[PDB]
Symmetry: C5
Subunit: 333 residues, 5 copies
C-alpha cells in the first residue's frame, strides 16, 4: 500500500531535526564503512596523485528513523538524503573529488525497520600520494586513502570497517597498466588535534612498478651507444678523422637520446636513478673521446706508448663500465 | 482548453510522492531503454576511454500519472521532471558524464493516458575502456557501455531493451577515424552483489583498428633500413667510405625512427609488438655495423678470413632477419 | 506608475502554467530565431570542432502574456525567465556550451502588448565539425550549427528564420587568424525520427585555409635542404669524406625536420599533403646519398661511367624534383 | 537597535518588485562604474586573450530603497543582492568570467539613506584581445575591456565612469613579466543595434613587449651561427672535408634552432618579424655553403678565380649581413 | 533529550537576521583566524602561483546565538552554516579557490554556551605569487597569502591571529621536492582604500630552491662540452678536418642542449642566470672555433706564431673559463 508507506515516511520525517546527530548528548554513533573499488583510473608522478573511483557506503543507526508495521527495507529516492542526517565523512588527502550525477546523483538511501540506515555514493576522487622516486623506475610506492569525520570528535562518532578485513573489495580486479598492487591494508585509529580526537580510517596500497618497458626502451639505447663508443678503440692507428667522426657521432647521439628521453620522462626536478645512469654513460663516452685525444697527441712522438695505451683502454673501458653497471644494478635492486 | 489540461496536470501531481517508486511494495517496474548514438568523439588509448554522445530514453509506467478525458499525449516541459519519479539509472563504467543544458536542459517528459512515461536525456559520457594493446596496431578492441540501477534491486526494477536488437540506433553512422564498428551487441542480465541482485544492460562495440597508415608508415622504414644494412655487406675495400656512410646512415636513421615512434605514439607503459619489432631491427643493424667493424679490424691480418666472414654474413643476415620476421608475424597475426 | 505595472505583471503571471506550451492542443507555436555572431574563438582540427560565441534570440507569441494599458515594450529582469515557458531549443552538434553569467546571467526577456515574447541569450558553444584533412593545409572545410527542438514535434512548434537570409549577422566581422569565411547559408527544414517530425535550422560556414605560414615554415626549408643535398654532385668524387658528410648531414636534417613537423601535427589516420611533400623530399635526399654510394663503389672499375653518372644526376635530380613539385601542386590545387 | 534595523530593512524589501528597474516608465537609471584592477594574470597569443582580476563597482539610485531614521550606511550581507534589482551589466568581449566564491561569494551591497545602492564584485575575466603579431616580438598591442548593458537600452539605463579618468585604479601596480602598460584610456559612448541604443564603456590598455629575452635567446644564437658560417672562407680551399662539414653543420644547427624556436614560440598562422629574420639567416648560411660549392667546383681549372671569389665573399658576406640587419632593425623600430 | 536541544536551537534562530552583523551599529566584531596547512600541491613559475590546501577556521562571538540550559558545545551539521551570519573573509591574491564537497561540504559549525561561534572550512586555493627569477635556478622566493574582509571596514570587523605566532600549524610538515620552506611569518595590519580601512592578515613563506638536480643535469653537460672544445686544442693544426669537425660538433651539441633545456625548463619570458651561463659556454666554444680558424689561416706563413698561439690558448682557455665560473658562482652564491 503506497499511501500507508507515504504516511509512515512522513511520520518519520516530521519532527525530525537534520541538524542533530543521532543520540545527541549520548553515546557516539558508530558508523561502519564499505569501499567497493571500481577502478584506479591512473597514477601520476608529475602531480604525485592517483585517481580512484569507488562505491563508498556508510552504515549507521538513527533511532528517529525507525519504523514499525512494515516488513520491508525502504530503498528511498536519493533526494530524501537531503532531508536526513548523514556523517560528515571526508577524504583527508583528496584534491578533487565528486559524486557522479548521471542520470541522477549516484546516491542510495536504504532505511531498515530497526532504524538502521545505509547511505551509498559513487565517488571519483584524486588522492595525493607523496612518492619517493629516488629509485625510479625501480621504485615501490605506498599510496593511501584517508577517511575522517570533519566536524564530530570521537565523543560523537566512531568509524569502523564493516566486514573486518574484507570491508574493501575490488582491489584484485584493478588493472593498472604500469603498477601491480602487491598488498592492501585497512587501518583504524584515532588522531589528535587541538579540537580533540577524531576517528580515522586508512586504505593503503603498495604499488610495484613494471620495468620491462624501461629496460627495452631506456637502458638498451644507452648501452648500445656505449658499445659503439668502445668500437672506436679498434679503428686503425692513424685515423685522425674517421675515428674522431665516430666519436662525434657517438657523443651527438648520446646528447640527442638524453634530451629526447628526458622529454619523455616526468618533469619532476630532482635526481633519479635513470638520470644517474645516463650521466654515467655520458661521462664514459666523454672519457673515451678524451682517451682518443690523448692518444692522438702522444702518437707522433711515442707511437709505441700510444698503441699500448689504446690496447689497455680496449680492456679497461668495458671492465670499468661493467663494474659501474654492476654497482648500479645492485645499488637500486 | 489549456485550463482543463492544467487542472488535470495539477490533479495528477497533487499527492504525488517522488520518494516512492511506482507500484511500491508490489511487482518491480519494468523500465525499457533506447539509445540513439549521435557520435563518438574519440577513443583515446592513452587514457583508455571513449567519449559518447547519445539520446538516452527510458520508458516506464506509473499508474499514479494516468489521466482521463484527454485523448492525447502530454509533452510536458522538462522542469516537471523534477517533480516526478525517475529511475536511478547510472552508467557503471564512466569517468565523467553530463547532461547538456543549452538552451534548456536537454530533457523530455512525455505522458500517455495509461500512465506511460517517456523520459529522454542527451548525455555525453567518457566511458572507460581498458584496452589491450599487445597486438598493436593490429589488435581488435571491445569497448562496452554498462547501464545499471543504483539503489533498487531486481525486486523493485527491471531493465530491458525496447525494440530488441533495434533498441540502439545510429551506430552505422558513427564516423570513427581510426576504427570501424565491426559489430555492436546488446546484452541484458542480472548481477549479484552483497546488497542483492541488480539489472544490467550492456552495449558493446568491437573495433578493428585500420591497418592502413600503420603498415604504410611504420614497418616499411624498418624493412628498408634492414635492407640497407644488408647491402652494406657487398662492399670491397676500395669503397670502404661508402660502407662507412651506409652504416652510419643506418644507425642514425634507426635511432631517429625509434625516438620518433616512441614520442609520437600513445604513451602506454607496457611493451607491445611494434616496440619489439623496432628493437629487433635496431639490434640487427647494430650487429651488422659490429660485423663491419670486426671485418675492418681483421682485414689486414687475414684478408681471406675477413672475406669469408663477409660472405657468411651476406648469407646469414637476410635469412635470420626473415626467420625473425616470420616468427614475429605468426606470433602476432 | 510602478505599482500599477507590478500589479499588471502579477496578474499576467497569476495562474500561468509553465509546463504547458502556448496554444496547447492547437496550432503549433511559430518561433523565429536570430543569431548575432560575436566571434569564432578557435577551429581545432585535433578535436575537429570550432568554438562560436553568439547572441541567440527567440521570438514567439504567448497570448497568456498579452497585456493592455501600457503602450511600452516591457523589458523585464532576466530572472523572470524562470517563470515563463521558453522553447526547448538545443544545438544538435554541440559538445560543451554554456551561457555567460557575469555579472548576471546574459539573458533578456522583452514582452510586447500583443503577447509577443523576445528571449535572448549569450551562448558560447563548441560545435563539432568533422573535417576532411586529405588536402591539408590547402583544405576547404564546411562547418554547420544545427538548431532543433528537443521534446516538441512539428505539431507543437515550428521554427523559422526571422528576417530571412538577414537572420544571421556579424559574419563579416569575424576575425579568423588562419581561415577566411567564404560563404554562409541558412537552411530551414523538418527531420523525421521515430518520435515524429522535428523542425531543424542549419547555419553553415565554408572556411578556406591560408597557406602562407606553411609555405614559409615548411615548404621552403625542405626545398632548400633538398637543393643543398644536390650540392654533392658538383663536389669531386675523390673527396669521399666531404660527400659522405654532406649526405649524412642532409639525411639527419631531413629526419629532424620530419620528426618535429609530424609531432606538431595531429594523429589523424591518413596521409596529408604536407606529409606527402616531406616524404618526397626525404626520398630525394636519401636517393642522392645512395647515388653517391653507388658512384663511389663503381668509380674504381669504370671512372668514365662514374663521371657520366654524376653528369646525368646533375640534370636528373633537378628535373625530377621540378616534375614532382609540379604534379604535387597541380594535384592538390 | 538591531531589531529596528531589521524592521527598516524588511519594510524596504516588503512589496519590492525585483523584476522592474528603478524609476520604471520614467527617466533612465544612471549607473556609475569603478574598476580596481588587482592584477593581469596572463596574456596568451595562442588564444589571443588576457586574464584580468578586478574589483568591479556599480553605483545607482533606487528611491524604492530610501530609508530614514538611521544616519548610517548599511553594509548588508552579499546574499541580499539576490533580493535587489541589479543592472544586467556584462562584458562584451569576455570568454570565461566568474565571481570568486571563497569563503563567501565576493560581493558587497551598501545602501545609503537617500536610496543609493553600491554593488561590488570581484571578477576574473578572460577577455578576448585580437593581436596583430606582424611585428612579433617587437609589436605593441592594444587590449580592451568592453562593458555593456544586455537587456536595458539607453531609454532604461545609462553608463558613466565614476570619477572621470580616476575611475580605474591599480594600473600602475600591474606586473606583467613580458609587457609594460604604456597607457590606459576610458571611453563612454552608445552602440546602435536592431533593438535600440545601448550604453557602452571601454577600458583600453596599450602594452609594449619586452625584447631582452628575445635578443638573448633568439636573435643572438642566429647571429652567432651566421658569423660562424663565415669561418669557411678563411680555410684553405683544398681542405674540402673541413669546409663542407662547416657549411652543412651550420645549416643543420640553423634548422635545429629554427624548429625548436617555432615549437617554443606561440603558434600563429601567419608570418612574423622573427620568422623573417630566421629565414634571412638561413638564406645567408645557405648562400655561404653554395658559394663554397662553387669555389670547390671551379678551383682546379682556375685557382686564381677561386681565390678572387673567396676574397670577394670575405668582403661581401659580412657586409651584406650587416646591411640586412641594419635595414631589418630600422624597419621594425 | 534531543527535542529540548531542537527547541533551544529554534529559539536561537527565531527572528535571526543573517543580513546584520553581530553588534550592528556598535563595536566591531573580533574575528580570530587559525590556519592548519595540509600541503602545498605545486609551485608554478610559468603561471607564478602556488596551490595551497588548508583548514581555515574563524572564531567570533555572536550574542544572538547565546543559549542557556545546555552546558555543552553544540557541533551542528554544516548546513546550518547557511542560516547564520559568517564573515565575508576572502583571499586577496587568489585565482581559483573552492571548498571541498565530498562527501559533504567540508565545513564545521560549533556553537559555545557564551554565543561563541567556530566556523571551519577546508579550502584549496591557487594563490598568485610573483617571482623574481633572475637568480633562477638559485633564487629564494617569497609567497604570501593575504586575507581581508571584502565588504566590512575596520569599524565593523577586526582580524587577528588566534594563538599568537602559533596561529598557523603544519608548516614543518610541508613536503616540497623542488623547494624548501625556510621561514613563515604572520602579519596583521590595516589597509586604506577609497572606501575606507580594511583589516588584513598575511601568511608569508620564504622558499629556497634546491640546485642539485640543476647542477647534475644542466651545468655539467655544458662544462663537459666546453672541456671537449678545449681538448680540440691539443690536436695539431695540420689536421683541419679533425679540429674543424670537433669544434662545430661542440657548437651543435651546445645548441641542441640549450634548445632542449629551454623546452624542458619553465617558459618564463625574461632572462635568468642559467641563460647567462649557457650563453657564456656557447661563447667559449665559439671563440675556440674562431681561434682555430685564425691559426689555420696563419699557420703556413707564420708556423712559429701559430704554434705559440695554440700553446698559449691551451692555458688561456681553461684559465679564462675557470675565472668566468668563479665569478659566476661567487656572484650568485
Ligand atoms: C603505508 O604507510 C602507512 C604509514 O605511513 C602504513 O600505515 C600503518 O600501518 C600499520 C599496520 O601495518 C599501523 O600499525 C597499526 O596501528 C594500529 C592503530 O594504532 C593506533 O591505535 C592503537 C589502539 O587501537 C594505539 O595503541 C596506537 O598507539 C595508535 O594510536 C594498531 O592497532 C595496530 O596494532 C597491531 O599490531 C600490534 C602489535 O604491533 C597488536 O598488538 C595489535 O593487536 C594489532 O594487531 C598497528 O600498530 C600504523 O598505525 C599505520 N600508520 C598510519 C599512519 O596509518 C601503511 O600500512 C603502509 N602501506 C602498506 C601497504 O603497508
Ligand atoms: C565484449 O566482451 C563482453 C564480455 O566481456 C561480451 O559480452 C558478452 O556477450 C555474450 C553474447 O555475445 C553474452 O552471452 C550471453 O549471456 C546471456 C546472459 O546469460 C547470463 O544469465 C544467464 C541466466 O539468465 C546465466 O545462465 C548465464 O551464465 C549468464 O550469467 C545469455 O542469455 C546468452 O545466451 C544466448 O545463447 C545461448 C546459447 O549459447 C542460448 O541458449 C540463449 O537462449 C541465448 O541465445 C549468452 O550466453 C555474455 O554474457 C556477455 N558477457 C558479459 C560479461 O556480459 C561482448 O559481446 C563483447 N563485445 C562484442 C562486440 O562481442
Ligand atoms: C555544408 O554542407 C551542408 C550539407 O551537409 C549544406 O547544407 C545544405 O544546403 C542546401 C542548400 O544549399 C540544402 O538544400 C536545400 O534544402 C531545402 C530544404 O529541403 C527540405 O524542405 C523542402 C521543402 O521546402 C523539401 O522538399 C525537402 O525534401 C526537405 O524536407 C530546399 O527547400 C532547397 O530547395 C532548393 O532546390 C529547389 C529545387 O530542388 C529549389 O526550388 C529551391 O528554390 C532551392 O534552391 C534545397 O534543396 C540542403 O538540405 C542542406 N543540407 C542539409 C543536410 O541540410 C551547406 O550548405 C554546406 N555549407 C555551405 C557553406 O554551403
Ligand atoms: C585601442 O583601440 C581603440 C579603438 O579600436 C581605442 O578606442 C578609441 O579611443 C578614442 C579616444 O582615444 C575614441 O575617440 C573618442 O570617442 C569619444 C566618443 O565618441 C562617441 O560618442 C560621442 C558622444 O559622446 C559621439 O559624438 C561620437 O560620434 C561617438 O559615437 C569622443 O567623445 C572623443 O572625442 C574627443 O576628441 C575629439 C577630437 O578627436 C573632440 O572633438 C571631442 O570634443 C573629444 O575631446 C573621441 O572621438 C574612440 O571612439 C575609441 N574607439 C572606439 C571604437 O570607441 C583605444 O583608445 C585604444 N587603446 C588605447 C590604450 O589607446
Ligand atoms: C614577503 O614580503 C612581504 C612584503 O611584501 C613581507 O611582509 C612584511 O613583513 C614585515 C615583518 O617582517 C611587516 O612589517 C611589520 O609591520 C607591522 C604592521 O605595521 C603597521 O601597523 C603598525 C601598528 O600595528 C603601524 O605602527 C605601522 O606604521 C603599520 O601601519 C608592524 O607592527 C611590525 O613591527 C614589528 O617589528 C618591528 C621591527 O621590524 C618592531 O619594532 C615592532 O615592535 C613589531 O614587533 C613590522 O614593521 C611588513 O608590514 C610586511 N609587509 C606587508 C606588505 O605585509 C614578508 O615578511 C615577506 N616574507 C618573509 C618570509 O619575510
Ligand atoms: C533487509 O535488511 C536486513 C538486514 O540487513 C536483511 O537481513 C539479512 O538477511 C540475510 C539473508 O537474506 C542474512 O544473511 C543477513 O544476516 C541479514 N542481516 C542481518 C543484519 O541480520 C534482509 O534480508 C533485508 N531484506 C530485503 C528484502 O532487502
Ligand atoms: C501517443 O503516443 C502513442 C505511443 O507512441 C501513440 O500510439 C502509437 O500509435 C501508432 C500509430 O499512430 C502505432 O503504430 C503505435 O503502435 C502506437 N503505440 C502505442 C504504444 O500505442 C499514440 O498514437 C499517440 N497519440 C496520438 C494522438 O497520436
Ligand atoms: C524535552 O524537552 C522538551 C522541551 O522542554 C519537552 O517538551 C519534552 O517533553 C522533553 N522530553 C523529555 C523526554 O523529557
Ligand atoms: N531531436 C529530438 C530528440 C531525439 C531525436 N532522436 C532521438 N531523440
Amino acid at each position: 500500500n503506497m499511501s500507508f508507506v507515504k504516511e509512515t515516511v512522513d511520520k518519520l520525517l516530521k519532527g525530525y531535526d537534520i541538524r542533530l546527530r543521532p543520540d545527541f548528548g549520548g553515546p557516539p554513533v558508530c558508523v561502519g564503512m564499505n569501499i567497493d573499488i571500481a577502478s584506479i583510473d591512473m597514477v601520476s608522478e608529475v602531480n604525485m596523485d592517483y585517481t580512484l573511483t569507488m562505491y563508498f557506503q556508510q552504515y549507521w543507526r538513527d533511532k528517529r528513523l525507525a519504523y514499525s508495521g512494515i516488513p520491508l527495507n525502504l530503498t528511498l529516492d536519493n533526494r530524501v538524503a537531503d532531508q536526513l542526517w548523514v556523517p560528515d565523512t571526508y577524504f583527508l588527502n583528496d584534491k578533487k573529488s565528486f559524486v557522479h550525477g548521471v542520470t541522477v546523483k549516484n546516491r542510495m538511501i536504504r532505511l531498515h525497520p530497526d532504524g538502521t540506515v545505509l547511505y551509498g555514493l559513487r565517488i571519483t576522487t584524486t588522492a595525493a600520494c607523496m612518492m619517493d622516486l629516488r629509485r625510479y623506475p625501480l621504485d615501490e610506492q605506498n599510496c593511501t586513502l584517508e577517511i575522517e569525520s570533519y566536524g564530530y570528535t570521537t565523543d560523537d562518532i566512531e568509524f569502523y570497517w564493516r566486514g573486518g578485513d574484507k570491508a574493501v573489495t575490488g582491489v584484485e580486479r584493478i588493472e593498472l597498466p604500469q603498477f601491480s598492487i602487491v598488498e592492501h591494508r585497512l587501518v583504524s585509529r584515532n588522531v589528535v588535534f587541538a579540537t580533540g580526537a577524531y576517528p580515522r580510517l586508512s586504505l593503503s596500497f603498495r604499488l610495484k612498478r613494471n620495468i620491462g618497458y624501461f629496460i627495452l626502451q631506456t637502458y638498451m639505447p644507452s648501452i648500445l651507444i656505449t658499445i659503439l663508443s668502445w668500437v672506436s678503440f679498434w679503428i686503425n692507428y692513424d685515423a685522425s678523422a674517421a675515428r674522431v667522426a665516430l666519436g662525434i657521432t657517438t657523443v651527438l647521439t648520446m646528447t640527442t637520446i638524453n634530451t629526447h628521453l628526458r622529454e619523455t620522462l616526468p618533469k619532476i626536478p630532482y635526481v633519479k636513478a635513470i638520470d644517474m645512469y645516463l650521466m654515467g654513460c655520458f661521462v664514459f663516452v666523454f672519457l673515451a673521446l678524451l682517451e682518443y685525444a690523448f692518444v692522438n697527441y702522444i702518437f707522433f712522438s711515442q707511437p709505441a706508448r700510444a698503441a699500448a695505451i689504446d690496447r689497455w683502454s680496449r680492456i679497461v673501458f668495458p671492465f670499468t663500465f661493467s663494474l659501474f653497471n654492476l654497482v648500479y644494478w645492485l645499488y637500486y635492486v
